[PDB]
Amino acid sequence: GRMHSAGKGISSSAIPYSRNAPAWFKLSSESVIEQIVKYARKGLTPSQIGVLLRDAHGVTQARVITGNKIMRILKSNGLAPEIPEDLYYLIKKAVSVRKHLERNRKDKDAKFRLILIESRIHRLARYYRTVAVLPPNWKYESATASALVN
Amino acid sequence: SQESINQKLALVIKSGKYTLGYKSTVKSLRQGKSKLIIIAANTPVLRKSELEYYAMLSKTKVYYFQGGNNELGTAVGKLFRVGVVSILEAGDSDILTTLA
Amino acid sequence: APQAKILSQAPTELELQVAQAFVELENSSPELKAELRPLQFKSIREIDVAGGKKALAIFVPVPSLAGFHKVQTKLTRELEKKFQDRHVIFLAERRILPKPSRTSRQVQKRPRSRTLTAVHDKILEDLVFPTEIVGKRVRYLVGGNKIQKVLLDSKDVQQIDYKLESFQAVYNKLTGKQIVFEIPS
Amino acid sequence: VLVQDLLHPTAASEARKHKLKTLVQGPRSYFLDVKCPGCLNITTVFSHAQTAVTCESCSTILCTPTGGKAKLSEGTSFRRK
Amino acid sequence: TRSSVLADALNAINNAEKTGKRQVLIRPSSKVIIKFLQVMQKHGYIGEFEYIDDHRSGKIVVQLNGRLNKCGVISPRFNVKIGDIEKWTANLLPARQFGYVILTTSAGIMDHEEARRKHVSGKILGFVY
Numbered sequence: 001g002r003m004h005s006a007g008k009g010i011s012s013s014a015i016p017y018s019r020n021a022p023a024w025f026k027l028s029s030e031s032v033i034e035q036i037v038k039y040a041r042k043g044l045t046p047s048q049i050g051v052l053l054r055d056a057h058g059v060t061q062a063r064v065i066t067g068n069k070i071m072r073i074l075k076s077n078g079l080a081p082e083i084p085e086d087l088y089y090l091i092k093k094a095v096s097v098r099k100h101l102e103r104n105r106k107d108k109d110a111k112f113r114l115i116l117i118e119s120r121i122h123r124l125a126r127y128y129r130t131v132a133v134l135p136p137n138w139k140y141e142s143a144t145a146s147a148l149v150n
Numbered sequence: 151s152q153e154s155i156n157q158k159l160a161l162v163i164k165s166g167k168y169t170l171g172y173k174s175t176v177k178s179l180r181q182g183k184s185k186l187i188i189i190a191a192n193t194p195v196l197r198k199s200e201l202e203y204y205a206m207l208s209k210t211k212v213y214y215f216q217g218g219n220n221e222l223g224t225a226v227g228k229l230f231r232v233g234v235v236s237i238l239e240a241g242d243s244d245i246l247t248t249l250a
Numbered sequence: 251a252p253q254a255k256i257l258s259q260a261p262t263e264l265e266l267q268v269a270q271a272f273v274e275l276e277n278s279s280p281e282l283k284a285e286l287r288p289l290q291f292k293s294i295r296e297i298d299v300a301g302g303k304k305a306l307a308i309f310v311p312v313p314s315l316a317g318f319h320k321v322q323t324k325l326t327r328e329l330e331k332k333f334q335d336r337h338v339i340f341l342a343e344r345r346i347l348p349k350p351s352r353t354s355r356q357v358q359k360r361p362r363s364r365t366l367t368a369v370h371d372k373i374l375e376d377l378v379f380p381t382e383i384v385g386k387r388v389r390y391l392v393g394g395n396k397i398q399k400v401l402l403d404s405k406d407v408q409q410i411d412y413k414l415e416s417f418q419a420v421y422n423k424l425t426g427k428q429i430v431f432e433i434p435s
Numbered sequence: 436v437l438v439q440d441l442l443h444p445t446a447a448s449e450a451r452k453h454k455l456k457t458l459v460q461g462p463r464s465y466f467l468d469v470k471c472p473g474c475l476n477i478t479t480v481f482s483h484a485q486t487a488v489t490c491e492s493c494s495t496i497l498c499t500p501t502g503g504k505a506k507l508s509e510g511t512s513f514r515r516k
Numbered sequence: 517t518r519s520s521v522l523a524d525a526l527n528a529i530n531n532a533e534k535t536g537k538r539q540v541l542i543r544p545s546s547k548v549i550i551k552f553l554q555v556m557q558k559h560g561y562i563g564e565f566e567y568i569d570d571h572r573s574g575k576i577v578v579q580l581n582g583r584l585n586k587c588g589v590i591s592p593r594f595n596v597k598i599g600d601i602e603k604w605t606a607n608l609l610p611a612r613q614f615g616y617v618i619l620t621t622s623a624g625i626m627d628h629e630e631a632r633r634k635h636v637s638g639k640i641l642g643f644v645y
């Protein structure tokens with residue numbers, strides 16, 4: 001089920017039983033990768049990048065055709081962010097809610113959802129600090145958190 | 151709908167060339183190197199007017215940040231407040247051609 | 251001498267006949283030689299088919315599999331034509347490393363490309379080479395036996411509809427496990 | 436029921452089932468080959484699009500996003516491949 | 517959250533067996549499940565079974581014949597000395613003369629009779645009858 005709610009929704013991507021394909025694609029992993037790096041230089045995330053290449057560039061997913069994942073490619077080319085998008089967007093969310101709270105002390109629901117968010121952040125941070133992709137402490141502090149994500 | 155100016159600037163700050171503060175803006179603007187200047191909302195009106203006059207002389211673009219110098223510092227990723235920014239090379243960004 | 255040159259090892263009469271076939275194809279020349287000069291094989295294994303024919307297994311290093319894979323159609327068509335009474339197929343010499351035991355031990359751990367199941371699955375995928383597999387099933391029969399059904403796509407199955415039993419025997423001879431193919435309708 | 440082939444179900448029952456709850460899950464989506472009336476360039480287009488995809492030139496509109504299936508623009512040539 | 521895929525499988529099987537169904541669909545699959553079914557198959561409690569290879573983990577379709585009373589699961593997988601299988605069998609089997617406890621050893625997964633013959637022990641998984 002859902003982490004911080006009773007939700008039981010299951011909308012997601014159903015990958016096909018295939019590790020190649022399309023036959024109809026016929027361009028190159030390399031030219032695709034050139035496109036990848038270009039849109040990375042534009043400063044997008046793997047998520048919207050793959051969305052773009054789905055909607056426009058005939059791409060199923062680079063997992064198939066390149067033999068690598070997006071974040072791996074960006075790492076190889078030196079385009080990796082300092083942090084992952086997960087924390088990035090979560091922190092944006094927390095900060096926005098915090099700014100809302102600053103001018104609405106009485107909104108209780110925002111307060112509630114904030115600690116939900118921060119607990120997500122802390123657990124996920126334990127994960128990433130376990131895998132050592134971060135410095136071992138890093139301790140998201142919501143006060144300074146603004147200029148981190150920004 | 152709205153692609154945020156903040157997200158644009160973060161690309162310029164990692165890809166492009168900027169300077170911060172009135173003195174360095176004015177220096178680059180005397181040099182004609184500046185393309186755009188961003189001005190905080192809480193900046194004094196005399197300073198704002200002075201910059202506008204230098205900009206209309208240099209034929210340079212002016213953006214008025216809907217935000218003060220503290221938020222503008224955070225937007226460009228800084229732990230201090232900044233009242234004026236000068237863009238001298240946009241990198242992979244689009245801010246020159248954007249709706250700005 | 252592009253004959254014993256083009257394998258890259260001395261033996262034997264079969265591979266030499268094959269190399270001279272390569273040479274006659276290279277002498278075509280233009281659109282053939284251009285992509286056939288880099289493509290060398292390693293070994294050959296001729297084995298029986300349940301009918302009358304035999305079956306050729308052409309082993310490869312696998313940095314060359316790409317160009318081999320670019321063609322497959324024509325090299326197989328001409329070799330089936332010339333070396334008749336046979337079913338030709340290409341294969342990749344993939345090294346299988348054993349899963350380490352507590353006694354047995356090795357650094358440079360053990361990637362999953364080199365594991366046994368993956369090597370066997372890919373060998374099968376190259377045996378079929380066209381017709382991307384679209385289904386695997388494994389019946390476990392009450393006599394303690396196992397058999398694998400492999401469900402193929404209907405596209406370009408015309409090229410290999412007459413090689414299925416030979417492929418079965420090949421997989422059995424190399425791997426030791428049974429096999430069956432299927433076309434959905 | 437009490438006896439049936441779960442390995443060889445009917446295509447009708449499998450096409451009406453949810454994509455994940457089939458015997459083997461897989462996408463119900465697809466790609467389109469598209470040319471607008473104006474230009475003659477080809478665009479590879481996903482059926483359920485999240486962006487307002489443009490063709491290579493003329494910068495206009497091919498398909499506009501929705502919640503599910505993409506809404507193709509005014510009458511254009513579109514295949515399914 | 518799932519905790520024991522085997523437990524889920526065998527509850528499903530037991531429920532279908534109660535209902536009189538002759539086939540079951542089980543998700544996800546695993547080597548241990550395969551070994552369990554091979555044991556039951558050899559001792560005649562089930563028919564053939566078919567492993568579908570999705571690229572995720574697998575499904576299994578079992579063809580059943582009846583004759584099964586209960587398949588069950590022991591969670592936790594207790595630690596078993598060779599002296600205690602008798603006590604277990606008395607506790608969770610209907611009779612001495614039929615029903616089989618299966619256990620996992622370094623020598624492999626097998627029934628408690630086979631473990632007796634090989635003079636080995638290990639960890640307990642479940643029971644079948």
Ligand SMILES: [Zn+2]
Nearest residue numbers: 490492494495
């Ligand atoms: Zn267009």
